[PDB]
Amino acid sequence: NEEVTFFEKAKRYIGNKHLYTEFLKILNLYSQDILDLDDLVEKVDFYLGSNKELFTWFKNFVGYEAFGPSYKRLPKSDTFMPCSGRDDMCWEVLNDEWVGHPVWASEDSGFIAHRKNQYEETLFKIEEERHEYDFYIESNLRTIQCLETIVNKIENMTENEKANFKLPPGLGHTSMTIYKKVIRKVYDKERGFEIIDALHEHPAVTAPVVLKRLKQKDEEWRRAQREWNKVWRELEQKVFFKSLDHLGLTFKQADKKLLTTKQLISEISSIKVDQTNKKIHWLTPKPKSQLDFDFPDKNIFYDILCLADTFITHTTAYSNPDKERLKDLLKYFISLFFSISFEKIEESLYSHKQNVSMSLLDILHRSRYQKLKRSNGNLVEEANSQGIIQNRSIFNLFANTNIYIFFRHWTTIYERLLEIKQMNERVTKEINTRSTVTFAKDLDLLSSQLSEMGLDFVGEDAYKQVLRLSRRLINGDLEHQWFEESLRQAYNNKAFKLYTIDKVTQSLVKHAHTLMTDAKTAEIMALFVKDRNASTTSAKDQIIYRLQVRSHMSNTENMFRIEFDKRTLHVSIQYIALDDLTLKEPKADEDKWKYYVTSYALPHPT
Amino acid sequence: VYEATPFDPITVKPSDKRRVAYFYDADVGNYAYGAGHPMKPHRIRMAHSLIMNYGLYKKMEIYRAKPATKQEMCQFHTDEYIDFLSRVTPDNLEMFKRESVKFNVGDDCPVFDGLYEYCSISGGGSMEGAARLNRGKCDVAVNYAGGLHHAKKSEASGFCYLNDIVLGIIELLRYHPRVLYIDIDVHHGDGVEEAFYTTDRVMTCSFHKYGEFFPGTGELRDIGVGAGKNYAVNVPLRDGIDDATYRSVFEPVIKKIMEWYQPSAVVLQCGGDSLSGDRLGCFNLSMEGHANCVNYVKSFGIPMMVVGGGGYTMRNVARTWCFETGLLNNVVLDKDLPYNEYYEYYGPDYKLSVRPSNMFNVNTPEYLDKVMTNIFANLENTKYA
Amino acid sequence: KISLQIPIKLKSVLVDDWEYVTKDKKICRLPADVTVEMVLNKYEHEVSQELESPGSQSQLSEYCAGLKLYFDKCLGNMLLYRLERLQYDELLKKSSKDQKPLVPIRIYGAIHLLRLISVLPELISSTTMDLQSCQLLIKQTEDFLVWLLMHVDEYFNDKDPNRSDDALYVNTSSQYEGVALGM
Amino acid sequence: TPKISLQIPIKLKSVLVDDWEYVTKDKKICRLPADVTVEMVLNKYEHEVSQELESPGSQSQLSEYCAGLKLYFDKCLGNMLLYRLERLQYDELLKKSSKDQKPLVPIRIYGAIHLLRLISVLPELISSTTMDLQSCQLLIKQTEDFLVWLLMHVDEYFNDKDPNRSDDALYVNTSSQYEGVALGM
Amino acid sequence: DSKVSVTGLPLNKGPSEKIKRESLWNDLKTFLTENMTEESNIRSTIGWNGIDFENEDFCSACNQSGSFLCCDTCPKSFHFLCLDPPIDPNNLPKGDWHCNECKFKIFINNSMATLKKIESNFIKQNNNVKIFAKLLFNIDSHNPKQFQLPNYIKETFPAVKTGSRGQYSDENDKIPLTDRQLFNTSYGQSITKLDSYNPDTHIDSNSGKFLICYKCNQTRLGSWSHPENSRLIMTCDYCQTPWHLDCVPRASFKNLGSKWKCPLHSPTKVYKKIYKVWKKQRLINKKNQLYYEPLQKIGYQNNGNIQIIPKITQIDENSIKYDFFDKIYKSKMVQKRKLFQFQESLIDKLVSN
Amino acid sequence: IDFENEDFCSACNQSGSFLCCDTCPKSFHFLCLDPPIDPNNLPKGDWHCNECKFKIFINNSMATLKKIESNFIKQNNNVKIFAKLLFNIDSHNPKQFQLPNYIKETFPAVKTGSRGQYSDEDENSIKYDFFDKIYKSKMVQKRKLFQFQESLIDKL
Ligand SMILES: [K+]
Ligand SMILES: [K+]
Ligand SMILES: [Zn+2]
Ligand SMILES: [Zn+2]
Ligand SMILES: [Zn+2]
Ligand SMILES: [Zn+2]
Ligand SMILES: [Zn+2]
Ligand SMILES: [Zn+2]
Ligand SMILES: [Zn+2]
């Protein structure tokens, strides 16, 4: 009675058939007493584990050695090897039974390695040459000291003791192959063997000549060592930091490939389908809008406007009137949307540019801006009665793809600049206290190439230095490589995000241009202006807004709703499923059903 | 049961005062693996120069361990392999063409010069330090020449020819009931795990990168067989592990281990291929994120021993071992390096800083939650020691 | 051409052996409990009481003796995989120590005899026998094959040598796979 | 295909023998309709034993085999159950049912003696079909347990109580009509 | 010394003019340790005393490479374990060593009449096993080999194929990777472990929709201005059901050894731990795998070797439903009556006191 | 070619007034068939026994035979265990009821001969799980009754 329903529930949950086929095969393997019981429970937990009630009912209803895949067991005939010094304990404690190996733990073919980009390869080569020279130097010295002491001890005797003196194998030292290796390196290995047995036989005639040969070779090798130490140090300083960022060489190609339109809508589509496919599970509450941005610091906007103004004054793609229209559109939009007074914008630009030493709709229909700048039953009644929002604080904007991608670019730039402006305090305090020891200053051991061109973060502040350097890059006053290197050494390889601070600005300018060159988006922004300038509204007015803006683009295009909260300076972006709630889902039956029966008043369908 | 945290700097404890011993054989650096071969004992010479130019010799005793003899290496190995080691040299290699294949020392771990000599030095260091720990005239025993945890019983594999970790640990086991081996190398120490896989007097704890990565061994489900079940902890991680992640994983798992297993002696293998900018490992640790583990294990205050390990770029490993010996004498070393013979190694700033990369840490808190929950589930059964 | 009809379960056993001795790196645990001499003796002894005529008994004993002699002269030559020859060779050496010659009929289990039978068609087709003897030998061999197919319940169990013990197969150490394969 | 056998108690075999003796020598023919049909017999069977079986599979198999015996018995009644004598009774009842606007269902008239007949014949029927080993083994197990229950409740309908009464004993003597048209008059 | 080293030049020479043009822009305290280093011998284990042809380049027996003991007559070459008998490598008999073929040819003096004669004599001698007579004469005319199953046992099963060196391959071998020789030639720092870029791994290729994890029902693409929210989707290799590495607790992308098998498959080996073994046969194709749909439904045993329909048994969902409920119901009642009888036994035993 | 007719009705293996098929050699009584047909209401045209009808039905094609048997055991999938029997009677020939020799080997007082005489000397699962649970409930109640009976015996 309840179990037919169980098999129907299982077929529903699994959703597919091949996986249901395997589910039934598990069940039958259990049925013919092949599978254990709790092995069946564990095998089904991979199927009905995302459900709690179904699997707990299954638990209450069904009434519920080399376990490591790396080792083998050898017979007790491979554990029989001499092992002389193995006492009674090293038999009881150690293990001779089980065996492992990286040739059959890798399945006879494997062992990938990391990538280790080219600059680390050159650094490794430099370190290897260093090690080689150091090894030969130290070995030559280590044999020279012993040969010197035996020479100094052997000459103080008479001719008789010299004639009968001989050295035992090892020269009385603790190592036996050092001097052999050194002499075979320097002395023509055949001649090296004959001279080494001559040294073992009669040192009184062979030790001085080998000693002086080793001395001259040592001084030659040391001269070569310093003359190569110069180049080693210079190349190591050239390519050290370039090798310490595993993302910085692939950010100028990841911020141009993962910052297109497809990906930009794809992340929000993905969080949407996640919300639905996981909302099928009923016990979870209904999730609200897709994306969340938060804007606690308002001063970066003037910096973004400064970057945009710098680009537009530099670029040659647009003509001067177009440049002014772009500047004024950006200024007024970011003053209106984020509710920043234009007078405060002008005071901020006053504070900014003095240290370097009509409405928005008037711009929407560009002719207006040209003229301006050349002049210089009871149900619906009682539903609309209660709930009137006075002193509007939460605003909304209904947008096609262009406004959304533009606001996306804006948020990307703001988030990157806020990252580095949150690091600024500590990184500046650190770079102010660089304790450079003069012992490296005098020996030319420090590279002042970054300090000579002024790109070094001297005790001036760091964030303003980033802004100024990025502006110099945008103008074309500084190459990309040196800006990158300044940002590597200055902060760390921790601030790699700002290598594309000019391309993202160019993209934001292109989108601010599309935001008024198109006709549909111009009218959508005009409706946005008309709603934003309003100070009080009702749900019916919001439905009029949504339907009017949807009337502009076709029934195949997407639509996004940007909900701006002025009390806490928040932005919430919602993907609009064409027949989803134009406002956010509440929790009250009252609000929901009265909102829909007031939408019923308009002749548009439900 | 994992939870991310910040990383406060390393602070020395005043009460935990130890008499350290530092073992160095003046010849360890004169045995060259070869032209380009990724292992050099040279890094021990540099580490030594850094350790002694800080004036750290006034804080600890410096010894020279007598190299091991053929009848003490065999406390782990088989006698035919030991005799091959003693006889083989780059000239007679064509003479043992049927033995170079059986023991796997012809090309993978080649014969260069003084192979038996370097192995004897390392084994002697390890065993002598373990013995000085026993008789009670020390608390720590530093040795950067040992730590060859890849060498098997009758074959070398992974540039490890004498598995001196095991000889030293056996020398420790001759008096001590329980030994805990903490392995923070980026690779898996399959030698010291397979060698003590079925025993309950030795507990290994190995924090290694798992993937298609050498030695391809060390899953989460390898908790020993027989009487050594739940007495082998493997923590397999992913790339890019950083200081805060590694600390938030290492601190709780090790506190639980030392809370239930309660070892009487520790062997910490602080290899240095788990650092950033290395040659074969893929982690992204910093010099302080690697010495935090040593400081935490020292915080417990039981007989301890620091061993060497991997380390394929010499400068980071030299500076790391210098800083670890520094905080092992209960001082936080100054970050400005003094003048040493190998000064020109430590470009470009000439300070005691190892700098992490911006590598992407791919260890999500859900994966580490799963892993540490599995590991605590296993560890539930190692209480009655 | 000549053709032999192996039961499908014996083909599955031969392919399982191909798995175990090839890339699973296992060898046969020698000397196995049930060898070729004992198997052929039990078969010839239990089938002997079937037919009364002397021709049947004579042909049975002749086939069994000839098959044991071909097993002796063939196992070392062509019935061992590459991975497991060293084992054989080691036994060969351990024979020369005690001055007792190696004849595999008493040491090697049934699976190598199964391999012999499996390859017997080509061995037959390469010589210059007549047409009658080929077919009579093939018929005797197929009777043996159905005998074995009925008796697979005792000879070819699967026991996972890594798990408990005493399986038909054993694991190889790294030294063995180094010297046997990579010589 | 196999050589399968059905262990039937000798008491029911003796009942078969005395039935043949009553229909061949004195040619006493069974009464149509019987006191209780075969539908009632199999229904009493499955209703008495379905309330003594635990698992759903056992009860599914019980009901399936009972319905199968119904279908076969009412299907094979005309081909292999009756002797030469009652074929006349069969044809006259068939023509009566034909003029009664509906075809006959042989489970409505006959009784347990013909069911025992078919059950005793069943082993050869199974043996001539390609039913595999487990299927036919289940068949004969079901049938064996059924006929064991039949032996257990032989008393109600098999032994003719008050044999002098023609209405109680289902065997009635034939008139000269059947005595003639049986042996060819 | 004039011998070039790894540095590129002899050791007694500074950088050449070329190198120092593209790698440019335009007391101590280790005097000690011969006063502080002191010998330590407190160890416990101190008492321990301590036609000009050329031979082939592949083994004539197993067709591989290694060390070859060649013949002078023929271009054949053999390993040391693949000889008759296998020869120990050190004590190798010097001189003119011939293989079995060449020795047999030189023994008959390359005349076939003597071959007929000796073969006839061998037939006459071995009269006891005459059927196997001629066979036991050719065993000494072939150089040894290694055993390869004939093609009519490899071709009875279709999912079993000879590897590169004649090894077992059972469709669970992933593939050889030639485009990973191209990964050796890698197209930049876009790793084959699939890190730092996962928009195209959370997206179905052919369809265009999203690869969803079976356990969490989310394709956590995150947002690639905050890449710390991806979750490393990987698709299984049999059922193509994609999982997160945090859901199937594995932490790697299986790339080399085998095909990854989802946690949604029923096993191909059990170890019931009575212990007992396998329940699944091989796939005996070439169209000799007969399917038999039984007439019995609720009691058939038949193996673990079934096939599901709406010697391979055929079975439908209803039969599995009924067998499963049968199992658990009769097991429940069995254990219930067992505990009932045991507790009543305990009661009657205790009241007896 | 006209074959010969056997004067014995294979249903009773005795002679009399009978009719035969056009393709089958044996004849049968008018009342030996099912339905037993009147001797005067003869079938129109050529009449065959079950065997020849089956032959012209299968067209001597084994594939059709297997197809019909499989789809028949699928039609009778409610009564599956009997299906293989139910398909065969649709093609067999009727014969008199004679229990095989295996039955009468027990009593020697009976004699028989060639004369054929004897001489004296879905809701399905719901209903089935319902049956299951009700029987199990009844039986566990009877088991606790067993325990109470035992305890009552201990009340002696
Ligand atoms: K252990
Ligand atoms: K490790
Ligand atoms: Zn390592
Ligand atoms: Zn070979
Ligand atoms: Zn030759
Ligand atoms: Zn997941
Ligand atoms: Zn899968
Ligand atoms: Zn008749
Ligand atoms: Zn006919």
Author numbering:
A (entry chain A): 663 to 726, 749 to 1041, 1063 to 1081, 1118 to 1347
B (entry chain B): 2 to 386
C (entry chain C): 219 to 401
D (entry chain D): 217 to 401
E (entry chain E): 105 to 130, 166 to 189, 255 to 478, 489 to 524, 538 to 580
F (entry chain F): 255 to 375, 543 to 577
Please quote the authors directly.
The Rpd3S complex plays a pivotal role in facilitating local histone deacetylation in the transcribed regions to suppress intragenic transcription initiation. The Rpd3S core, containing a Sin3 Lobe and two NB modules, is a rigid complex and provides three positive-charged anchors (Sin3_HCR and two Rco1_NIDs) to connect nucleosomal DNA.
The EM maps allowed protein assignment and de novo atomic modeling covering six molecules for the Rpd3S complex, including Sin3, Rpd3, and two copies each of Rco1 (named as Rco1 and Rco1′) and Eaf3 (named as Eaf3 and Eaf3′). The PAH1/2 of Sin3 and the NTD/PHD2 of Rco1 are unable to be modeled, likely due to their inherent flexibility. The Rpd3S core is almost identical in the apo- and three nucleosome-bound states, indicating that it is a rigid complex. The Sin3_HID/HCR and Rco1′_NTD wrap around the HDAC Rpd3. The Sin3_PAH3 catches an α helix of Rco1′_CTD. The Rco1′_PHD1 in the NB2 is close to the active site of Rpd3, while the Rco1_PHD1 in the NB1 is far away.
